[PDB]
Design an enzyme around this catalytic site. Structure first.
Site, PDB file in Angstrom:
ATOM      1  N   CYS A  80      -5.139   7.457  13.449  1.00  0.00           N
ATOM      2  CA  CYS A  80      -6.203   6.552  13.850  1.00  0.00           C
ATOM      3  C   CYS A  80      -6.947   7.185  15.039  1.00  0.00           C
ATOM      4  O   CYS A  80      -6.620   6.919  16.230  1.00  0.00           O
ATOM      5  CB  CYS A  80      -5.585   5.210  14.241  1.00  0.00           C
ATOM      6  SG  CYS A  80      -6.830   3.883  14.273  1.00  0.00           S
TER       7      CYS A  80
ATOM      8  N   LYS B 293       2.703   8.584   9.887  1.00  0.00           N
ATOM      9  CA  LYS B 293       1.565   8.456   8.987  1.00  0.00           C
ATOM     10  C   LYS B 293       0.563   9.579   9.266  1.00  0.00           C
ATOM     11  O   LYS B 293      -0.015   9.652  10.358  1.00  0.00           O
ATOM     12  CB  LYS B 293       0.891   7.091   9.116  1.00  0.00           C
ATOM     13  CG  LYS B 293      -0.131   6.882   8.008  1.00  0.00           C
ATOM     14  CD  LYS B 293      -0.601   5.452   7.914  1.00  0.00           C
ATOM     15  CE  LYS B 293      -1.458   5.234   6.649  1.00  0.00           C
ATOM     16  NZ  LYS B 293      -1.958   3.833   6.599  1.00  0.00           N
TER      17      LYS B 293
ATOM     18  N   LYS C  35      -0.013  -4.615  10.250  1.00  0.00           N
ATOM     19  CA  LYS C  35      -1.125  -3.925  10.891  1.00  0.00           C
ATOM     20  C   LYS C  35      -0.583  -3.181  12.102  1.00  0.00           C
ATOM     21  O   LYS C  35       0.384  -3.614  12.735  1.00  0.00           O
ATOM     22  CB  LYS C  35      -2.231  -4.888  11.345  1.00  0.00           C
ATOM     23  CG  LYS C  35      -3.409  -5.064  10.370  1.00  0.00           C
ATOM     24  CD  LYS C  35      -4.297  -3.815  10.288  1.00  0.00           C
ATOM     25  CE  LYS C  35      -5.097  -3.577  11.574  1.00  0.00           C
ATOM     26  NZ  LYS C  35      -6.157  -2.521  11.407  1.00  0.00           N
TER      27      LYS C  35
HETATM   28  C1  Y3G Z   1      -6.387   2.520  13.124  1.00  0.00           C
HETATM   29  C2  Y3G Z   1      -5.680   1.485  13.502  1.00  0.00           C
HETATM   30  C3  Y3G Z   1      -6.970   2.732  11.733  1.00  0.00           C
HETATM   31  C4  Y3G Z   1      -8.199   2.168  11.372  1.00  0.00           C
HETATM   32  N1  Y3G Z   1      -8.724   2.416  10.181  1.00  0.00           N
HETATM   33  C5  Y3G Z   1      -8.079   3.235   9.360  1.00  0.00           C
HETATM   34  O1  Y3G Z   1      -8.551   3.499   8.298  1.00  0.00           O
HETATM   35  N2  Y3G Z   1      -6.924   3.796   9.671  1.00  0.00           N
HETATM   36  C6  Y3G Z   1      -6.341   3.584  10.831  1.00  0.00           C
HETATM   37  O2  Y3G Z   1      -5.291   4.113  11.084  1.00  0.00           O
END
Ligand code: Y3G
Ligand code: Y3G
Ligand code: SF4
EC number: 1.3.1.2
Lengths: 1004, 1016
Positions: A669, A696, A572
């Site tokens: 994110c 990412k 995570k």
């Molecule tokens: C952050 C940490 C995130 C939360 N939910 C997602 O779908 N992607 C992320 O990168």
């Protein structure tokens, strides 16, 4: 002209198109009674006579599935924990796992799971009385739509594997033959080539024993599967296929050899040097009754042991090299008994030409012990049922049976069963078949078993845990032991015995075995296929990994994922102490992207989750622990900081120091929308650490190539494509969202994951791979199977991250993914299967997953499968079966030869990016090679959806016949392909090259 | 620190049943497996000879009953067939395709309205129709392994939801007001018998506007056989009352106590009293007798079905009678004679009365049983015995009681003649004998009262089978009395057929004609009066549903038919000037892979590589003129595209405006420049270009115009804002999402074009992109409040349409849902939206989610008994636990027997709106207040999951999801397979999201202290 109005011949084409109604419809009750017959699909409750079945050995099982039906039923299964279906299967098949593999289109992995625990897996799928076994425990019995068709799913997967023509291989975990200990060359004898011995020999061969011989009395192999189970429930070619798999392991079969006092005995086996023996001869003699003394087959009398092998020898090609006639069974047939054999005699008697069949039994209906699915076949074929009748005499005149005389039976009120001598029935009959069961009565066979102890029931006694007789080198199982009532239990008896035979033999040679029984799994050459891949200087043992997401909430979870077989895992996303967060709840919800369908296979999730709530110190210590214990499993630390150089350098160095193989930068994110910010973050990390790192990327950008290129320019070794799509998964009818947080019922925009976003992620992966050739891509977005993973590999990715498919299930899907990918790669080397699509055979014409008969008089004659057309089809099929009663049937090969690879098995590196050659601009598409739709009438189920879609979303190009409900594509088709896309039957509609002149419709 | 990446002992124990990959085959002896199988058993045990106890148990036993979860799954499975054979096979001709489509779209009102329009006893028929011999017998899905659709259970479900809404039927709103109806509609009409046939006939006559309709009923109860004989455990009495009260809403009067009989009501007395027409629907009121039963009495133990079944009905149906009737004491062995459908209801009812054993004995064979298999199956699973080939000869009586029946054996010939063998006898001990030989009309006074109509050789009144007229033109007949109908639904249909020709006859008597085409009115409630119009950018839409610019608007003739179907508006396919002519490739539209290998109805997406219309601007402009001339109230929006050229946009937009388009939609999908200066290739991805295009069009035309935005942008608000700045009157949000739908296993794409098998990126449409379109609509609506939005993206129902309205859209464009079906879904959308707005005014239904009742604790959609000793006792529905549940249920049915009170079936009073019905404009944007930033979400108010053990089906999916995607917070019991959420729950909500049972798991406010898991 009025351009916005249909001309007459289009109005005619549209005659059956749905329209809104403004009034209620008037149709008289009398008119409705007549019209009903025209559309009738199912049996008519008022029809009392058998459909003509003479010489018709077509499959009558209600459970048989084609691929379309198998995929639907496999997606319906909840794939339960600690599943009760498996608890209720005598061979303990991991049903959850094999059905999961079917739903993922991995028919090889399903078959491998089935045959690992049941070497007669296809026979059992076909014949198991599942309502009294696995299906009887299915949790979905508690839903209206009911339990899963486990047997049909097992049959379907095993049939696909059979069609793959792949051999079983020697247990690849064994040392090579020359280095096996001497104990494994012990001479082993099995008596009788039925399900029990076939299982036992198979498992003993898996363990490495190299001198295993089955001695079979008859000249045919398979036991009751061959000699008595009807061809229309169990085709003989299934038996031959499973026996071929066993012979692949080196088991020998010698026919024409009997256990009997003047032939093979325990004493002669011992004197010939055999170290162990398994008795699997079943119950070879019929239970007889004095009232049938002296009656011959010519007079009209059979036991089931006389009758069913005659029918099997005639109808099962290659069983008995001779070609035999069907017994001439005309007139009224009485079958005596109500066990499961009685129902097979009754249905078989119809195939031999019986006019009428009566099942007569001495107790009541509530006392029939046959399983309901067995009973229902005789019922639907209009067999009569006579309860509470015990036979007293057979009347014979002019040398033939003319009647049977019965007395009435009744239970008093102590439950004793009485006969009432004043209450008789004189039932006319031309043929009598007793189905009273079977026994071992031959004194010469029993003497050959000296000196093992027999019990009350005249059967060899065994320890029920070990299957050992009173003589320690002799074991027994199957029908001869008297516990098994089924093929699957007889299979399980041989399986159980094999471990303890193994134990006994090893001990005789001075060797011990594990205190925990450990029988090997089932293996083929597919299992040796290498699915490792190298990317960015990292070696992945397989390409499947856990995404940075809820399945990596804790490092203990990653540990269990690696123990299950996952090639890699992300943590995570974690951050520095100052960036600590607190998640809200609720925060993860199901997708509404495929309607109100609950349970397995959710097509998306939405989440409003933040970074990990666990500290960097937790995650760094955990990475050190994980890499210490799983050095071959790749661990990637996902990290995030705010837009600050010192933070990104601090956190990336901390994760590097813990031993992470690589880093993943969470830019998705937002920093990840802006190429300049992405480039800068990547540069900061690239100056801080020496291990690879991946950016990412978010899909929520106008052009994902611009941010991939920025990451590359900043020094990233690759990109992960993609994170979740920003979305709102919807509202209750009162307006409140889901998720709704706090008393205010508030939400924010969330990330959509799962198969609903796969087209977006596939687009991202291919466009990055075309823009930045060779640049490593880690794919994420809807990967839930080996075939979908292979789509991303073909698209340019090197490894495959998974989140939602695990949320929908559990970590064990990794075994499905690995076996499925091995099989997809293996099948590419088989020239004979080149017309399959992956693991799916080319679709044949079928109805209800049964092949349409190829009879001239049926093709093109516009006979749909309902009403009077169906009646005509049945007459045509019956006449063709009678025509076939006069002709030779070929033999299958004495035994088939497996397909052999004719080119190297591709490695992962050989498939990456191979789809890109077909991708380009719209201007690179031919507009002169046009297609049209063409419908296979024999596969059509008459719903009109093609018609409705061409009418209201197309070109009004389909005729839909008002009487047959058969569609025909006309020449005004443009090949838009919408009709194919809505048809419920896979490959019923196909697009073919247009042959007539094409003119675009310009309306003008 | 210890080993952080290992589970501690407590968690390892929690994970004990978690799936793990196996490396070896499992050893389990055949004996151990036999002994374990009983623990998990769900279905009947073939070895069980022993019918579980059913005394005084009138709970629903129908196999076809559905709850909402089951109904939605089954309705989505239906192919929704053209010219559907199920409807051909339904005697009342129900539009099964339409009503099941409505159920799949969660529009239970619209489904019930369609059901009751053609069948006023639609709930009764849903429960009791022998569908295998009717609609289901024709179902196309019989040709699949999974089989035919449960049509009856679906009909029952929608009708049950409608019954719960407590909405009345209204007078046909197409009629003039009562005081200006012609005098003919006040003709006095009589119906005899208040059974299904007359209830249907009176209903349809009242729909036509007749205001003086009286049903004369012999008994004190109403409903005919549905009340007096069909068992409560198949047809609850409150269903009958609900349908009766719906008919009474139309003014039909019922007078009980008055018989068609000499010296009472006759055709002569009706005529003398000025009745102008009469319908005979008295059924077959008497039992078919047999000489061998002469003189036998109930005290001795003998009953016909006409004595026994009404006795059971009176005792078990609260509100049938004033008499709290004692259940007949039927101890011992019961012989039921016959094997029609009545015999099986006698058998099952006898068990409710306390029979120890029931024998069903019939004079022919098994193959000759005429009952439908549904009815036979219920008697078999309850372990009745079946004795064929026996004909009764003697009833033996000792000590004032039946002790036995003696039979002769029967036999067929060559000739198929049935013979009886005098020398072949059966003496069967019995305590009770029930004859189920059928029903007859034989009372001489009753037949005399029908003088002088003609009777046939079967002593039944003759009718013309098309008109149901008897030989007297003012007298009609139908139902059981005519002898064709064998079912409730055919009896309903007889009354339906009769009502039109009664209408024709009465009108002719008053000198008036009727149309040559029979026109019976539909079924109406106050919901149908609800206004769903909306105003947007100065345009008036008669409803908010319209056809998007797409394949359903390939041709203007299709728009014409969509307007005829009821669509409020339509877009043309995007068209361009002549110099921009294109040629489509093929294949170019394919199904989505977004919900796996599910084929047929309800595709979750499509992908298309289609271009602009291949038809000319001249075709489209002339078509728009024609459509606007013929459908002035239907809004037509011309969709147009040009290259980035001021003169082109002005020329084309003026052409479209001059044709009479109500509005324009600018398709901003044309490429310009290179396309990745951060803003991509299409004009719609760059705010500068959108602003300029909109300026050009605003200068050129005076009608409203809307910019169609692409979702394939970093910030869609910036494009919408640019369009507003350029002068656009609104935006269409959104076009398709760019995607690649998938590859074959050999690497080739689909669609694949040409021998080269080439493709290019396409647009994804459908429910798979709905979260993207909903987010786009919501963000624009919050950033640009009051700027009109036309929503597009996965709208496929009134419910999903209302989500978009709540999110800030004013109107609702549809493509993929029509591709999945046809234009008639508009009828479902309109009634569904009316119903959703209506229900918001009904205070008593606040707990519902739209048209979905609050979910009650159920198993297979039947409610679980609320019994103390049954609740929280850790008794799942399998194995030995199920058998304890059955013992507890049976004991409580008995305790409800020996105290025989409680007969208060509530009197049904409809709910009234407590506020005005919201209009469309009242709900637009009302969800937007709940949206906000993440920092506006409370992290103090946490939830946890709680599981209703009574709803659980023991699958362990919650457990597996928390184990491998969560916090290992659920205990899954190894013996009961029941889950329990523990206090380490974080409220993440994944378990709820994967559970197959709707609302089995709920998220509740956390009450214990909360601390985030930080791992350290
Ligand atoms: C952050 C940490 C995130 C939360 N939910 C997602 O779908 N992607 C992320 O990168
Ligand atoms: C032109 C054009 C289009 C084709 N297909 C789409 O999905 N959207 C369009 O705008
Ligand atoms: S997922 Fe639902 S039905 Fe399955 S065990 Fe959990 S609570 Fe029960």
């Amino acid at each position: 002209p009025v351009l916005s109005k249909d001309v007459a011949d289009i109005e005619s084409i549209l005659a059956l198109n749905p329209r809104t109604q403004s009034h209620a419809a008037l149709h008289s009750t009398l008119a409705k009674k007549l019209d009903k017959k025209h559309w009738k699909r199912n049996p008519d409750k008022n029809c009392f006579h058998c459909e003509k079945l003479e010489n018709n050995f077509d499959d009558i099982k209600h459970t048989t599935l084609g691929e379309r039906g198998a995929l639907r039923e496999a997606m319906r299964c909840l794939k339960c924990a600690d599943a009760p279906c498996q608890k209720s299967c005598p061979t303990h098949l991991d049903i959850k796992s094999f059905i999961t593999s079917i739903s993922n289109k991995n028919y090889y992995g399903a078959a491998k799971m089935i045959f690992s625990d049941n070497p007669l897996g296809l026979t059992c799928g076909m014949v198991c009385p599942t309502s009294d076994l696995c299906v009887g425990g299915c949790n979905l019995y508690a839903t209206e739509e009911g339990s899963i068709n486990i047997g049909g799913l097992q049959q379907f997967a095993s049939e696909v594997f059979k069609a793959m023509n792949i051999p079983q291989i020697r247990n690849p975990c064994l040392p090579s033959q020359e280095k096996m200990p001497e104990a494994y060359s012990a001479k082993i004898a099995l008596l009788g080539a039925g399900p029990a011995s076939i299982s036992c020999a198979s498992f003993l061969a898996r363990l490495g024993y190299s001198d295993i011989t089955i001695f079979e009395k008859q000249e045919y192999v398979g036991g009751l599967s061959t000699s008595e189970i009807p061809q229309f429930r169990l085709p003989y070619d299934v038996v031959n296929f499973e026996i071929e798999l066993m012979k692949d392991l080196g088991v020998k079969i010698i026919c024409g050899k009997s256990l009997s006092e003047n032939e093979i005995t325990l004493n002669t086996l011992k004197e010939e040097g055999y170290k162990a023996a398994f008795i699997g001869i079943g119950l070879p003699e019929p239970k007889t009754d004095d009232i049938f003394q002296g009656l011959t087959q010519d007079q009209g009398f059979y036991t089931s042991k006389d009758f069913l092998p005659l029918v099997a020898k005639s109808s099962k090609a290659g069983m008995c090299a001779c070609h035999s006639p069907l017994p001439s069974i005309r007139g009224a047939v009485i079958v005596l008994g109500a066990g499961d054999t009685a129902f097979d005699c009754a249905t078989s008697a119809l195939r031999c030409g019986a006019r009428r069949v009566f099942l007569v039994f001495r107790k009541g209906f509530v006392n029939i012990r046959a399983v309901p699915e067995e009973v229902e076949l005789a019922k639907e074929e209009k067999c009569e049922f006579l309860p509470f009748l015990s036979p007293r005499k057979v009347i014979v005149k002019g040398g033939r049976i003319v009647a049977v005389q019965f007395v009435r039976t009744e239970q008093d009120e102590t439950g004793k069963w009485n006969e009432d001598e004043d209450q008789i029935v004189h039932l006319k009959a031309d043929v009598v078949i007793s189905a009273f069961g079977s026994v071992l009565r031959d004194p010469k066979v029993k003497e050959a078993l000296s000196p093992i102890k027999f019990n009350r029931w005249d059967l060899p006694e065994v320890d029920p845990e070990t299957m050992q007789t009173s003589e320690p080198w002799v074991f027994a199982g199957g029908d001869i032991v008297g516990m098994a009532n089924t093929t699957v239990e007889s299979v399980n008896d041989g399986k159980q015995a094999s471990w303890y035979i193994h134990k006994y033999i090893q001990a005789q040679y001075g060797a011990s075995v594990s205190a925990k029984p450990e029988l090997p799994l089932f293996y083929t050459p597919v299992d040796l296929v290498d699915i490792s891949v190298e990317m960015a200087g990292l070696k992945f043992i397989n390409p499947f990994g856990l995404a940075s997401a809820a399945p990596t909430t804790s490092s203990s979870m990653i540990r269990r994922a690696f123990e299950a077989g996952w090639g890699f895992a992300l943590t995570k996303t974690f951050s520095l102490d100052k960036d600590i967060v607190t998640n809200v709840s609720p925060r993860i919800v199901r997708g509404t992207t495929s309607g109100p369908m609950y349970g397995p296979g959710q097509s998306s999730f939405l989440n409003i989750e933040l970074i990990s709530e666990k500290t960097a110190a937790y995650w760094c210590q955990s990475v050190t622990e994980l890499k210490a214990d799983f050095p071959d499993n790749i661990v990637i630390a996902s990290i995030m900081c705010s837009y600050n150089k010192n933070d990104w350098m601090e956190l990336s160095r901390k994760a590097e120091a813990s031993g992470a193989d690589a880093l993943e930068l969470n830019l998705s994110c937002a920093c990840g929308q802006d190429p300049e910010l992405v480039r800068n973050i990547c540069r900061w990390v690239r100056q801080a650490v020496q291990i690879p790192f991946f950016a990412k990327l978010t899909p929520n950008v106008t052009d994902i190539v611009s941010i991939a290129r920025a990451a590359k320019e900043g020094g990233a070794d690759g990109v992960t494509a993609t994170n979740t799509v920003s979305g709102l998964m919807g509202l209750k009818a009162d307006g409140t969202p889901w998720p709704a947080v706090g008393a205010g019922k508030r939400t924010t925009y969330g990330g959509v994951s799962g198969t609903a976003i796969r087209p977006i992620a596939l687009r991202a992966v291919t466009t990055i791979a075309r823009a930045l050739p060779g640049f490593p891509i880690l794919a994420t977005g809807g990967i839930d199977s080996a075939e979908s993973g292979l789509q991303f590999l073909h698209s340019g990715a090197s490894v495959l991250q998974v989140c939602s498919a695990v949320q929908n299930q559990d970590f064990t899907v990794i075994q499905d993914y690995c076996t499925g990918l091995k099989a997809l790669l293996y099948l590419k080397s088989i020239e004979e299967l080149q017309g399959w699509d992956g693991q799916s055979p080319g679709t044949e014409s079928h109805q209800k997953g049964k092949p349409v008969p190829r009879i001239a008089e049926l093709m093109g004659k516009k006979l749909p499968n309902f009403g009077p057309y169906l009646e005509q089809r049945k007459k045509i099929i019956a006449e063709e079966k009678m025509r076939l009663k006069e002709q030779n049937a070929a033999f299958p090969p004495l035994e088939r030869k497996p397909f052999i690879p004719k080119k190297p098995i591709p490695a992962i590196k050989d498939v990456i990016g191979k789809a890109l050659q077909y991708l380009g601009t719209f201007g690179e598409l031919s507009n002169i090679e046009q297609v049209v739709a063409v419908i296979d009438e024999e596969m059509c189920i008459n719903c009109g959806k093609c018609y409705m879609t061409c009418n209201d979303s197309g070109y009004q190009a389909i005729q839909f016949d008002p009487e047959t409900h058969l569609p025909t594509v006309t020449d005004t088709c443009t090949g838009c392909t919408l009709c194919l896309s809505v048809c419920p039957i896979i490959d019923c509609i196909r697009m073919v090259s247009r042959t007539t002149p094409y003119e675009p419709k310009r309306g003008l």
